[PDB]
Curated annotation (Swiss-Prot):
InterPro entries referenced in this protein's UniProt entry, alphabetically: Peptidase_S1_PA (IPR009003), Peptidase_S1_PA_chymotrypsin (IPR043504), Peptidase_S1A (IPR001314), Serine_Proteases_S1 (IPR050127), Trypsin_dom (IPR001254), TRYPSIN_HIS (IPR018114), TRYPSIN_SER (IPR033116)
Keywords linked to the UniProt accession: Calcium, Digestion, Disulfide bond, Hydrolase, Metal-binding, Protease, Secreted, Serine protease, Signal, Zymogen
Organism, as annotated: Bos taurus
Reactions this protein catalyses: Preferential cleavage: Arg-|-Xaa, Lys-|-Xaa
Protein name: Serine protease 1
Gene: PRSS1
Summary of activators and inhibitors of this protein: Is inhibited by scorpion cyclotide trypsin inhibitor TopI1.
Expression tissues: Synthesized in the acinar cells of the pancreas.
EC number assigned by the record: 3.4.21.4
Subcellular location: Secreted, Extracellular space
């Protein structure tokens, strides 16, 4: 179950702020964040180094987003391809509390434990959970799971990290025997790398 992570123990976790915290994201290099496409809105400020999002604790960096790129195939009705890129107006200063997370070179296997993190209650919360089998995932949500999603279990846009790689983005679910559903990042690595290299 969920627990308090501890301040800055997830240094790639970002908060997206439009006047309030509305979604999480993951820092993938000094200039770029990955989040969920369903988090898209105007006027995004990226907040790095956060623990308590309501208190300035001394390790934060606040940087305006300069560009947002929603995946070309994003379908908001089904949440298929629920992934977006956010460019920072200026490069983050990387340190022990503000660090990038590596993209995977291959997909993760069912049964691998992952760290899922996010807010939602003002400090960062964490959950360790294994990737579920395809059958368990699709049986929980008949007709709704595509090859661009996976489930884990037993803050939209936040990271799912497995074996040191960003394998998922918090996308949707009904757990509020219904596990969380995550965008399958390994399907998008080419698109991520090309899109950031061209922007």
């Amino acid at each position: 179950g969920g627990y308090t992570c501890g301040a800055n123990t997830v240094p790639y976790q970002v908060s997206l702020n439009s006047g309030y915290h509305f979604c999480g994201g993951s820092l993938i290099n000094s200039q770029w964040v990955v989040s969920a496409a369903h988090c898209y809105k105007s006027g995004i400020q990226v907040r790095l180094g956060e623990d308590n999002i309501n208190v300035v604790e001394g390790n934060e960096q606040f940087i305006s987003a300069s560009k947002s790129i929603v995946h070309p195939s994003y379908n908001s009705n089904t949440l298929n391809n629920d992934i977006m890129l956010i460019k920072l107006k200026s490069a983050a200063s990387l340190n022990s509390r503000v660090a990038s997370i590596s993209l995977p070179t291959s997909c993760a296997s069912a049964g691998t434990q992952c760290l899922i993190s996010g807010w939602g209650p003002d400090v960062l919360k964490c959950l360790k959970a294994p990737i579920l089998s395809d059958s368990s995932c699709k049986s929980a949500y008949p007709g709704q799971i595509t090859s661009n999603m996976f489930c884990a279990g037993y803050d939209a846009g936040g990271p799912v990290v497995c074996s040191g790689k960003l394998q998922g983005i918090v996308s949707w679910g009904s757990g509020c025997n219904k596990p969380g559903v995550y965008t399958k990042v390994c399907n998008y690595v080419s698109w991520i790398k090309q899109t950031i290299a061209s922007n």
